[PDB]
Swiss-Prot record:
GO terms of biological process kind: eosinophil chemotaxis; epithelial cell differentiation; innate immune response; macrophage chemotaxis; monocyte chemotaxis; mononuclear cell migration; mRNA processing; negative regulation of endocytosis
GO cellular component: cell surface; collagen-containing extracellular matrix; cytoplasm; cytosol; extracellular exosome; extracellular region; extracellular space; ficolin-1-rich granule membrane
Domain Galectin: 6-136
UniProt binding sites for a beta-D-galactoside: W69, G70, R71, E72, E73, R74, Q75
Protein name, UniProt field: Galectin-3
Major place of residence: cytoplasm
Modified residue annotations for Phosphoserine: S76
Gene Ontology molecular function: carbohydrate binding; chemoattractant activity; disaccharide binding; IgE binding; laminin binding; molecular condensate scaffold activity; protein phosphatase binding; protein phosphatase inhibitor activity
Recorded name of the encoding gene: LGALS3
Amino acid sequence: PLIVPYNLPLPGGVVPRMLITILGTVKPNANRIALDFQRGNDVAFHFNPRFNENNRRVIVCNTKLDNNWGREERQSVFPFESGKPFKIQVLVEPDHFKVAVNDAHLLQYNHRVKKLNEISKLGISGDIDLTSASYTMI
Ligand SMILES: OC[C@H]1O[C@@H](SC[C@@H](O)Cn2cc(-c3cccc(F)c3)nn2)[C@H](O)[C@@H](n2cc(-c3cccc(F)c3)nn2)[C@H]1O
């Protein structure tokens, strides 16, 4: 494969028990990946693996409101590797997004944007070959 950046519409927004699955492969020498769950111009949930921030690998999560980034939430557990295939699963739960990578729980992100049914796009960006992006209800 899909063209990156990729826009996946989420019809009617998100809702608890919606599971979003992203399959791809990290490029060689990757620097960054981003998933952006968007409410119009706002980013309800930005999930941003950084492969070289001051020579460290870190996951940064944040929200962008009225074009302003908020307070970052950081996770140093880092399950991605340059050149390797991955699966990201984002399960919407009542009070947070729950993220697993390669079937292992990674992090939760509490809902800052609370109009879940207005979070109606997922952008997928950065240093990946994107194989598929889809959603289902569990
Ligand atoms: O906030 C999140 C934002 O970050 C900024 S970079 C600056 C901050 O990182 C500053 N900062 C440090 C800290 C902090 C807090 C505690 C400890 C600590 F060490 C540090 N708190 N704030 C970044 O451009 C943003 N962005 C990334 C992308 C993007 C586009 C395409 C592909 C892709 F993969 C990503 N588009 N926009 C977005 O990721």
